[PDB]
Amino acid sequence: ADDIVLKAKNGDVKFPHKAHQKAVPDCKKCHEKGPGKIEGFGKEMAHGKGCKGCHEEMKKGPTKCGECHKK
Ligand code: HEC
Ligand code: HEC
Ligand code: HEC
């Protein structure tokens, strides 16, 4: 649905694929080739302009460790 768990060898990341909708009604923001899986995505990405990127972008959202990686 919206709740998506991103397996990580450094602590899984709980991503709410919902609140990120009303906050970013634009799905073309992340989904470039349309809704679906994202090819290439990864660490550098998540930390880059994948997750934090946006976060640190607006200074909103978890940008510190532990806030994403929960053991
Ligand atoms: C970035 C903040 C996103 C926005 C905006 C939207 N979605 Fe999304 N979606 C995102 C991720 C990170 C993922 C998983 C892939 C990954 O790289 O981790 C997804 C996945 C989907 C899927 C596939 C899951 C499934 O149902 O099988 C769909 C169908 C999907 N997303 C649809 C969708 C729609 C309709 C959105 C706007 C209403 C939308 N997404 C916004 C990240 C982001
Ligand atoms: C902008 C394009 C974003 C991208 C890309 C991602 N996130 Fe995000 N996130 C964003 C905002 C603006 C906020 C604050 C809430 C709001 O009003 O939109 C957040 C918040 C989170 C949170 C915590 C919010 C909560 O649950 O209360 C988490 C855990 C989070 N974001 C995770 C996350 C992940 C894992 C992403 C990559 C898959 C990701 N976000 C991308 C804006 C954006
Ligand atoms: C959410 C906004 C995150 C924050 C904050 C940080 N990281 Fe992260 N990291 C995130 C994701 C979504 C992923 C990949 C999970 C997936 O499968 O989608 C990662 C990955 C890592 C890794 C590599 C794990 C692996 O599987 O190889 C490392 C070593 C890592 N992250 C470290 C790390 C550090 C040091 C952080 C603070 C500076 C940090 N993460 C925050 C999402 C998020």
Say how many CA atoms lie within 13 Å of 8 toward its Cβ: 21
Cα 27 to ligand 1 centre (Å): 7
Locate the ligand 2 atom nearest the alpha carbon of residue 20 and give its number: 18
Instruction: Provide the Cα torsion 63, 13, 69, 61; round to 10°.
Output: 20
47 has binding-site annotation: yes
Residue 63 · residue 56 · CB < 8 Å: yes
CATH number (3.40.50.1100, 3.90.10.10, 3.30.70.20, 3.90.420.10) of 1-71 reads: 3.90.10.10
Pocket of ligand 1 (CB under 6 A): 4, 17, 20-21, 24, 27, 29-31, 35-38, 41
Q: What would the DSSP string read from start to end of the chain? A: --EEEE--TT--EEEETTHHHHS---STTT-SSSSS--SS-SHHHIIIIITHHHHHHHT-S--STTSSB--
Experimental method, per PDB record: NMR
Ligand nearest to the CA of 31: 1
* CA dist., res. 7 & res. 9, Å (int): 7
- Could you tell me the residue ranges of all domains in the chain? 1-71
Rounded-to-integer distance, Cα 11 and Cα 24, Å: 26
Decide: 13 and 46 in contact? Cβ < 8 Å: yes
